[PDB]
């Protein structure tokens, strides 16, 4: 009994340190940070369907209400990808080191790990749902962005000249957000929760 | 009675028209508009203060979620108040005429009258309110002042980064928002429904 | 009873004044009186018919009265069918919020409103028939054109070189009058006398 | 009898053609006509006077109505009088010729001569006054003096727009007519009427 | 198991009130297998009632495709019997296997044609029970060249059904990476939670060979492991051999094996029946959720009907209301455990 | 000598058990020679059996290839006496002389066809011996007339083997530089240490010729030096004349000969017995640093396959591990001498 | 007051000692006849009084391509400067005929033939 | 504020007294075009409005190789200096064609022709 928890379970905890935060860990990590803005890009719009509702509405708090809260429900599509590759490296790594051959022990060893990354990559996967539902009850207005007065990430004229920067802004603005908040999310739980399960819940359940 | 009604209370409608949508709330309103920015300044606040609040979180986007509760809730002083100022003179002109001798007759006579505007002042207000309330909930990031990375307008990597930039101007710009937006508001709504009044209610109960 | 009273017949009016005074109900009514101006040209003339007259009348003040009178009956056709116009979109409004399917009710709520309306495109009416027959009594020279000495809207040249210009402005300018005239009327009447009364003669006698 | 008449009161006759019609009524006629205007300017008005009314009304074509009555009734007073200047000298001609000496005679001659004429100068002034009453009644647009939107010659869009700049020029140029009107109108009547007198009336009652 | 039972049936009740879904779909258990499984026997074993045909080497001789339907005309019925109703699930079982022996011998004689039966009765459970045949790969007594075949696709039609519970029981004497037994089963119910290999008659294996790696639980490990049995023969299913006998011939052979004798303890038809039950509760409760979004919905409905009676001038509301309010309940309390 | 004997078959067992190269590959011992060396009597001298036939002039007149093997049947295998199998060695010696004598006559004719013969017994040590023709420059008896070429390639194939013993004789009546029992045995053999130069025949050589140089020991100083010897005539072999006797007629030549009486005392086949077995000893020991270190790198092998029983939940190795620990022991004994 | 028309007609007989024949531009009311040298009238060629004027068909006139026609005060002699009657002429007879029916409505009466 | 476009035109009516027609940069905007001596703008030959401008097909110009079109004010006589319309000329008929077209979009409409 003292052998594996002794070697078989500690070195690999160092393996642990090693692997996650380091091609290596080391930028096999960063590269799905920053090639995952991509996947927004193509799968999102903005612009001139958004513009449209502009005009009905003014006839500026008011108009705003209706225009935005329709638009925002579809950047679901992308931000879900980037959960699942950060679970391809994680996910399988804790399991890797865990067997090391013997009679009584291996079942339970393995039981204590492997329902952490379940209930996991649920806590990821939902912040990403409340996330999007929420703009349908917000539509804040202090913001980032400029001012009024590939996806970016007879005298009528005058009229609307004024109201149009206003709403045409946040549509646009929405996909910048996602971009860097997705990659954010994981770092924290993805990638850290997980991290620390695997190194010390195995070990001390056992030697009890 | 359908040729009392039809004249006798008709003439004394038309009247409401003339003051009110072409002193009266013509020009009483038009004073009150471009001193309601005064109003403003006083009981609101930016800058340092609300930086406090952030050393809570931080010692990304959760933490920096709670910040502005109580604040924007504090921008309601002035934006109401603005809506009594024309209240007072001008709800007043409909509820004087209902005197105009016999003491048989004028007891009836009073007690129709006063009821309906009274609640629709209520209105009014509860417009401004909706927006206010909307302020507490997410903070995102697009909208006016400045990203991270008259009112003014070790891993730090991926925490403080943005933070920093965005707090101190933040409150500013919404202060902004408000002063602009009553204005306009009070066109639509306070001048014309107190209009009806006169016009119409006077006559109602007497058909029965 | 109270929910219908509260609710039904009172977000109705704020409906009112939404859909009299705002293509929707702001610009559906500027139509109709910019438009209407063309109506006028088509069924009414002027020019030599009453240049005519002129020549037996004088062998200034009592050659002038006969010559005018006989052209005025003639302008009745044109007047009349801006009223109808305006009605269309009045009439129907009303009605449209009455029901909101129960068993006591409705009846006694729809009788008050509906009639007013009947009383009221006679108002309008007859203020364009009066119009009309004035001109007989009438025929000033105080009034507005061009001095003596498409509708508008042997040496016997020298003897009635001075008095022609007197006879021959007034009915070319009597179109000038009626295009704008009617509208102005209807905007009294029509409009503003109805949009009052909805708003308020209902409820009053309701709640007692 | 019917040699008396025929030769003796014919002669007496043919004397007045000559001096009326071709000092007598000829020549006094001319001095009269062209200090008349005169007259006119003093017993009548114009300008801010008339303003005062039209603050009555506005504080549209129905309540612009009102405005002139006193002020065109006045103006009676100039026009009138020059009559009686006329009258004067001319009239009393006829009446002195019937003393022309047997007091059995004379007594039945006087009685007859007088009347007719006496009434027919009522006549001239009365159809003057027919003008001057007709001013009165409505006041529409067109005729001379300018168009909103010697004698001079908030919803503000519907009411003021017009009104403004017609009532002060407006009474100014009603004196223009009158000043003319009459010169012209007395060498019809006047002059041709007691013309008619001495000619017939004097031979009449004795044909019996 | 103690809050499974209760709690499924309450909801059920609710759910076929309200004309939808009742769903809590319990398993369908069939037992599949090479020839000489036993299969019948331990199909019965789990069931708790006889009623299946019985054999040594190929056991289930017709399908019996029995169901269990709620009713209150209490009655079966078969296709090929015109004019048979039973109401003793004893006298199916008397009926069906007496008539066959007498007419087939006991020499193994097989037919693939299928009893279609549908037993009606007020004290069941609303479940599927389906004996299958085996599939063979060698004939045996009067069976066809080409038996293996036939029978393989024909089980497939029944076992598609994703919650069914089989009990892959496996003959020594042929290669168990070449058995038909374990391929078909293992791709139906894959977890290993509820599926436990089971390995009959391995008295009659080739001198040379064993199972010892996979018996042992050590090859490849499974939270329960594995249970071997050791089924009854021709002559005791004869004459109608009582429940209980099986198990006694499964003893014998394990005592002088050198190679299973470690492992007594761990074998026994009583102890697949423990294990079976707790994997069981689990399926049920995850399906929760699903059921009670939709029921809230409903019961709104029908409240702007009263509604709009109040204001404008001249029993299917009551009874779904009643029942939508019941079924919300039951769910919550469920998942709370 | 007196290490040697024991270590060495210890040590040939431990590495029989583990089935690995047992070497410490003991002598071959073959005589070669011109004709009329005596060769057969040289050989069967220092082994100390009675086996080889023996003639004067030509002696071995059939190749006797004998290998000794170790093993429990105890018989022995004539390829061209179907039928035979002696077990008695003196048996083996009668039967091939008496039967080529009573058929061939004495008169020295050969046959080039060997006699492949295995003698099986426990009671011996795996060796072999090799007694070959002798090669010859001229014909005697009935041989043919190019009887040199073809016994000379023939012993090529069995005196290769790299620890040939070689006691290389040469008629002293043929030219000791045109010798070709030196040629072949001074190639195979060189270092001189266990090749004693053996010159028999002295009494027939020409009138005016001697080998007194090589014989004294000073022209070319050996170790050991030279050791002549004068060996049995046909007329003795005959009568199965014993081992002791050829000693006795190498006396007479020796004291009426000038140039050879004074080396006398260095003379005789007891003492050439004597220095061949103390250069053996040397040979072996020189091989044990190599076998010992492939024996420990095993051992270890299999504690692996113990050490992977106790952690992850669910004879050959005996033998060898004994056997090894053995073999390393012996091998250090032998080499501290 | 009225402009009866206005149109381009060749002044035929101007003397050598000012260019020779030039188009000049026609202005015709119904109290004057006057032309200029274009139509800014900023120059003022000058302004022949329609009294007494009367119109006549003026055979071929000189031995050229031109048709003339001519206008002639009835009672004196030169018609304006030096002229006797003002020489019109057009390079076709349609220009000339339709000139001379506006001078008609103007009070240049016909006869005198 | 948006360019509507930037491209060189040839002002064809320059005097002697400056050069000559020499090729100048033009900007058009919704309110007004502006014509530098080169794309730097450091310079500034004029800022013309857009107001009330109109557009014509000038029918050939001068006797030239110039196909011209021009700019004019209708409510008044010079469009800019003491020029009546503003000349612009291309070598190729093409080059007039498409600065014609953007014209149109910045308000200055056709007829007048």
Avoid: W
């Amino acid at each position: 009994k003292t052998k594996a928890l002794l070697q078989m379970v500690q070195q690999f905890a160092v393996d642990f340190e090693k692997r996650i935060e380091g091609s290596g860990g080391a930028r096999i990590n960063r590269i799905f940070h920053e090639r995952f803005p991509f996947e927004l890009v193509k799968m999102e719009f903005d612009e001139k369907e958004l513009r449209r509702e502009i005009s009905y509405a003014i006839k500026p708090d008011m108009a705003f209400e209706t225009i935005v809260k329709k638009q925002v429900k579809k950047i679901r599509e992308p931000c879900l990808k980037c959960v699942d590759m950060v679970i391809s490296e994680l996910i399988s790594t804790v399991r890797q080191c865990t067997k090391k051959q013997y009679p009584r022990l291996r079942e339970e060893m393995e039981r204590i790990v492997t329902t952490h990354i379940r209930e996991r990559e649920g806590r990821t996967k939902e912040q990403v749902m409340l996330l999007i539902d929420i703009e349908l009850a917000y539509m804040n207005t202090n913001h980032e962005d400029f001012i009024g007065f590939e996806r970016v990430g007879p005298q009528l004229e005058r009229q609307v000249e004024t109201i149009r920067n206003l709403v045409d802004s946040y549509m646009a603005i929405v996909n910048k957000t996602v971009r860097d908040l997705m990659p954010k999310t994981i770092m924290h739980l993805m990638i850290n929760n997980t991290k620390e399960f695997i190194f010390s819940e195995l070990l001390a359940n056992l030697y009890s």
